[PDB]
């Protein structure tokens, strides 16, 4: 109920081995049923208003939520969470139809919170988990190799502290672009230095809201490629345990699930977007991802 699992299939770029029916909420390659399904034609704005938008209402209530993008490389994970700029500087990013979830989300927050007329405060942070180590993508001064320290939080027994993690204040929607642009530059230095790692790292973006005093928080997680590990294995199980309420959820077995435990249980909503390729050679992988999403929340066909 509070954990939605949706699939989105991307456009190619001819042999189509998949198929998706939105009304019957089914993906056929072999057939699975989900909370929602998006076919190749599907558009960034659609994904946003169906999956993300309801979750952000909750976040604005003072809840803490998380949205994952899961899948292999080439399926639209970075496309879905981040997006691209349309050609010829035709659009502002707030209007760009090719803008992914993170931009739409930050735009939406300033739209909704400005409409409300109340004093509010916005904060973002972005961290990468690579080989069970945590790195801060928004700290301007730190070298790209500095690991962060995290430990359990004496005040919060759902929580941890990530020590020194930069929380950047976004004063207005405009400033958001500079912030994440530097982050992208840093992250491009980290990938060069360490083992061509963009497919191997987990991105945790976090926006936190202070409404003057209720606090919402949303974490937008772009996981490392699901093709073949541990952080992926552990999350399935944390998800499995949260679906059925089998006690002692194994949060402690990965950095990801420890960092997230606070949101992953509490009064919350959690979604994961499983991304798949239509193309011929991806087939083993598509099946893993649907199986994985199937394992996550098990929904029998109709």
Sites of contact with ligand ADP (CB under 6 A):
10-11, 13, 73-79, 84
Give the CB-side neighbour count of residue 221, counting CA atoms within 13 A.
27
User: What's the min distance (Å) between Cβ of 79 and Mg ion?
Assistant: 9
Q: Counting beta carbons within 10 angstroms of the beta carbon of residue 200, is it exposed (0 to 12), middle (13 to 18) or buried (19 or more)?
A: middle
Pseudo-torsion of CA 259, 262, 264, 265, nearest 10°?
A: 150
Closer residue to Cl ion in complex, CB, 43/163: 163
109 binds, among ligand G7X, Cl ion, ligand ADP, none (CB under 5 to 8 A by kind): none
User: What's the min distance (Å) between Cβ of 161 and Cl ion?
Assistant: 6
From the list 41-49, 56-64, 101-109, 278-286, the region that binds ligand G7X by CB under 6 A is 101-109
Q: By CB under 5 A, name the one of 24, 43, 49, 163 that touches Cl ion.
A: 163
Within a 10 A sphere around the Cβ of 294, how many other Cβ atoms?
A: 18
**Are the beta carbons of 113 and 211 closer than 8 angstroms?**
yes
Query: In the structure encoding, which two tokens stand for residue 239, read together?
Result: 């998800």
**Are the beta carbons of 192 and 172 closer than 8 angstroms?**
no
Query: Measured between alpha carbons, how far is 286 from 292 in angstroms, rounded to an integer?
Result: 10
Query: Measured between alpha carbons, how far is 30 from 299 in angstroms, rounded to an integer?
Result: 14
Q: Which helix (H) or strand (E) holds 239?
A: helix 230-244
Positions touching a copy of itself (CB under 8 A) are: 43, 45-46, 49, 87-92, 95, 97, 111-112, 114-118, 121, 132, 139, 141-143, 149-156, 159, 161, 163-164, 166-171, 174-175, 213, 215, 230, 247-253
Closer residue to ligand G7X in complex, CB, 33/105: 105
105 is in an annotated binding site: no
236 is in an annotated binding site: no
Q: Which residues make up each annotated binding site?
A: 71-78
Annotated binding site for ATP: 71-78
Binding site for Mg ion (CB under 5 A): 77-78, 198
């Amino acid at each position: 109920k509070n954990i939605q699992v949706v699939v989105r299939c991307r456009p190619f770029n001819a042999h189509s081995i998949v198929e998706c029916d939105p009304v019957r909420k089914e993906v056929s390659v072999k057939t699975y049923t989900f909370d929602m399904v998006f076919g190749a034609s599907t558009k960034q704005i659609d994904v946003y208003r169906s999956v993300v938008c309801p979750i952000l209402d909750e976040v604005i209530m003072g809840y803490n939520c998380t949205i994952f993008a899961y899948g292999q490389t080439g399926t639209g994970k970075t496309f879905t969470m981040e997006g691209e700029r349309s050609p010829n500087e035709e659009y502002t990013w707030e209007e760009d139809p090719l803008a992914g979830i993170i931009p739409r989300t930050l735009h939406q927050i300033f739209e909704k919170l400005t409409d409300n007329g109340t004093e509010f405060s916005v904060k973002v942070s972005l961290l990468e988990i690579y080989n069970e180590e945590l790195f801060d993508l928004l700290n301007p001064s730190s070298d790209v190799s500095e690991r962060l320290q995290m430990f359990d939080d004496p005040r919060n027994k759902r929580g941890v502290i990530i020590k020194g993690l930069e929380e950047i204040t976004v004063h207005n929607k405009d400033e958001v672009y500079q912030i994440l642009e530097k982050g992208a530059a840093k992250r491009t230095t980290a990938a060069t230095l360490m083992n061509a790692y963009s497919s191997r790292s987990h991105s945790v973006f976090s926006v936190t809201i202070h409404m003057k005093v209720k606090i919402g928080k949303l974490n937008l997680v772009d996981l490392a490629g699901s093709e073949n590990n541990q952080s992926l294995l552990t999350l399935g199980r944390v998800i499995t345990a949260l679906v059925e309420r089998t006690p002692h959820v194994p949060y402690r077995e990965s950095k990801l699930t420890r960092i997230l435990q606070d949101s992953l249980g509490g009064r919350t909503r959690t979604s994961i977007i499983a991304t798949i390729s239509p193309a011929s050679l991806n087939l083993e992988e598509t099946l893993s991802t649907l199986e994985y999403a199937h394992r996550a929340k098990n929904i029998l066909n109709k």
